[model samples]
Target: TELLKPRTLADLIRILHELFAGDEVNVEEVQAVLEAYESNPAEWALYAKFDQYRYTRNLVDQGNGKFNLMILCWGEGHGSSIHDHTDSHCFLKLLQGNLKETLFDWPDKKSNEMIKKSERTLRENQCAYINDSIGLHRVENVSHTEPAVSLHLYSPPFDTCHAFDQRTGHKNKVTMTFHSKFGIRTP
Candidate 1:
């Protein structure tokens, strides 16, 4: 299906400012904004190139702890490790191809095994909203020959997140760096 032109990065930042400038903000509000912009997937098409190694490319950074937008590219058989978003609220919009997402339960106090909670496949133009408190999860491209693309928006931007190994009960922090900023490759 064809979508209208998406709002510009500056427009999105302004909308977020209005949404968050008030008191407490919620996931639904953020989700609404993301969906509104995502209706025009073609606007994000230029940033969909896959890395062949990893998935994240920063598209916009409204610094000062406000928010940042990223374009994630996933090659065939590529996926993320089970991880948590730390304290950032996240919204994801699938721009191209397909993705399979699995949600896991956080390990119990006595154990570090993350049990599978649910799983779903997202097609083009689909959107998912995640609260900071949302449990551990992973995402896969779900295609053998095609790469998938997703747009991620985070509030109160985070540079680090935690990844967990359920089998070994191992946990580590991952520092996220951008592959690009404002559509330009970063050094």
Candidate 2:
């Protein structure tokens, strides 16, 4: 594949600043930002590498203990398990490939592992906003036939995330991890 246009960190900063300026952080504003990505996922997707998922954050402080500027990247079949940001609001932008966002929501009295669930699928050039306070959800590749990729920003960098095993209703709080090398899977 040819090299995709590079996504400058500076450009991302400008977009974020203008999008969320002087306003209460909410899903609508986030959706607008995702629309920016839909307009041109190729540029943002350039930051991604095959077999290696990449995520970056501004680490900027948004008063009120709210996290912000959380970005993500992924390859085909590369997706997250059913999880939540522990009360964080999130918005995702599909930068490349075909992505599917599967959303789930329900009550959880037992533990992070088991929560009632619902899901929906999002395709290329589409976006989704999520908030744990409102519900729970998960995102995955559109299908086995194609790999999906995208970018995500969370108000208040994800200091923590709630991970779950939908099969057995298991849940746990885990710190996110980043890898320097593109695992052996990248072509």
Candidate 3:
């Protein structure tokens, strides 16, 4: 049977569009689709670019508030600061190399301390899901010796988020920017 054939990114995008066309979402269904769709760089490599200074956020497709797909390239030692999803659902799938996803408890309004919760090292093709309700997290390329790439899908497209400093548990509203859009560099 051809059931094992890897699906193209076009297929993945269509699936997400259908799944999110309605108001409410089914997270399990979303995760199932993400896990089932095999990763193939040939279909998405055009949109990926690694940066020495920081991880590059490259847009693969823009669907207004329905959803957005991004190919994030992370160089060795590159990672993200602890951040919240701002009421949107975030799904990250490691497309290449390895990455460490560190989860932290939501800071208490009184104490403002975000306790370390758990950490997971995601191998290629592994996926992780997070939302504001699940708590905040920071992702890094734990495979330190090499570069990594991840496919990110954000629903309703959040343009900004709150990043927290673990040491002080202080927060700042950071506006997001894209290093590239539709496989074209913005810089």
Candidate 4:
């Protein structure tokens, strides 16, 4: 399949500004936006270079100032740890394969706790809308026996992300490395 033009990512960033600016986000909004993305995989897919994708790179990041974007390619058994973007919003569009996603939202408890708010099974051509409010999330391959692929875009892109240790409830800060120069900081 052909891949998306570079502008497609820009289009995504623009949508983010409109959907999340000054609004109380809800599940319905998320579903609606994601559904829109689900309807447009060909746009981004039109630009995907599968050979380059196999190398596992964080595609693009303009700066740490406001927003960022990443294209993540996952192999069988590969997955993301539970983590949050600190103060950023994340939008995911699945380019290929199947993924099991779990989204965590803050629990009502007074202890700043988080709990599983929702979960979904996403396949090729599906998209997700996320933000700092419900940044805690994990994405994994449904069957370790098969490979999975996805595209991850973060606004106000950066190298570091705040992740939590599920068992100890310990919050640790970590810097993520991009697989290629596509994410080098631009002055």
Candidate 5:
């Protein structure tokens, strides 16, 4: 018997479903799966919905509160507000272009900026893992003229998260929505 590496988005989904069915999700195994995957537009472009005014979140697959896979398309210069994962684990892999990710500590009381924890630019095929315990983060496309896309796997699907105001440190709760689902556009 031989295990095979996933070569496409469909394969990735299959493996993820298998891994998550276990008692405890394996973190390293999840990372290995993402790292092993190649960033191919042909496999994922169907789910990318890049917007002119904001980055688009496209749902690819889900397992009824277990986890959800997503394709996030970022138009050039578009970035996310500092946000948390609502206690869920988020695995994000760059599928195209470079993305600058900034990690920050939870905001201090009395209206001040959250402390910067770390930052880095993720090149294509690179993956990063984050959870609320690690820190909150903001993801941005680092290109001026080119759009970027990333594949994200969020365990135990979350619907609401707080978006922090950088300057005032105010946290606003946001209800997550999809620009598309399973490659179909949403209204």
Candidate 6:
């Protein structure tokens, strides 16, 4: 499908407001909103930027502690660690280039076997959702020469995550930090 027109940051904020205003919220609702935003790539310019190092930039924070939004810039061949999203529900939209996502399931919590659920590639305009129950996953920039950008929305924004090492049976809590806040670089 093709996008009819570009979408602005204001449009995104409005959509989020409409979605979260309801009495009930679910993965489907978040997915639909993200898909709608993804379709309008032309308006992604403000949030689409790449760094030599993979980093996440905070785009919006409700500050009320309900939810937060971020744009992640992945350098070519860079990826995130296999991690869980704490308690937040996450929705991701691929805005530029390509990304490979690998999901894992922990059937045996004490053992080293974290089942590889699925592996998939996300191209521009593609969207996906993950909740706390299914948040064990890793994301990488698969492009050989180009970077990738993804928009992420998290409900009840998380401060920390449980990162796992597939190679070794290691799990540790990691603090999440933003490279930038409100489009400005943070020190």
Candidate topping lDDT? 5
| Candidate 4 lDDT, 89-151, residue by residue in tens | 576767678888888764332445456778899877677767767557888775666566566
User: In model 2, which runs have C-alpha deviations exceeding 4 angstroms?
Assistant: 1-12, 21-23, 38-42, 52-71, 110-117, 180-187
Off by over 4 Å in 5: 1-4
Clashing pairs in 2: 67-155, 67-156, 68-155, 68-156, 76-147, 112-171, 113-169, 113-170, 113-171, 114-169
Q: Who is ahead in TM-score, 1 or 4?
A: 1
Residue 128 lDDT in candidate 2: 75
Point out the higher-scoring one by lDDT: 4 or 5: 5
Model 6 over residues 21-49: C-alpha lDDT tens digits?
Answer: 65456667667657766445555555655
Can you write out model 5's per-residue Cα lDDT over 1-187, one digit (the tens) per residue? 1235788878978888888886577888888888899887888878988789999999999955579899999998999999999999899999999899999988777798677778998999999999999989999996898899999989878979999988877899899999999999998
lDDT of 3 by residue, 40-87 (tens): 878888888877789999998876568888999999888899999989
The lDDT per prediction is 0.73, 0.55, 0.85, 0.59, 0.88, 0.73
**TM-scores of the models, in the order given:** 0.83, 0.68, 0.93, 0.63, 0.95, 0.85
- Residue 52, model 2: lDDT of 42
State how far residue 131 of model 2 sits from its true place (Å).
0.5
Off by over 4 Å in 4: 1-55, 61-66, 106-115, 183-187
Give per-residue lDDT, candidate 4, residue 13: 49
lDDT of 4: 0.59
* Cα RMSD for candidates in order: 4.0, 7.4, 2.7, 6.9, 1.6, 3.6
Q: Residue 87 of model 5: what lDDT?
A: 91
Total residue pair clashes for candidate 4: 17
lDDT per residue as tens, model 1, 1-187: 1223337645665676666665456667666666676445565665665577767665755644567777888888888888788777777887778999888877755655677889999887778876547777888886889888888877777889988786754678898877777777776
Candidate 1 clash figure, as a count: 0
| lDDT (10s digit) by residue, model 2, range 98-158 | 6655656653566544444555566665777878776667676646565555656676556
Least accurate 10 contiguous residues by lDDT in model 3 = 1-10
Best by TM-score: 5
Residue 122 in model 4: lDDT: 86
- Order of models, best TM-score first: 5, 3, 6, 1, 2, 4
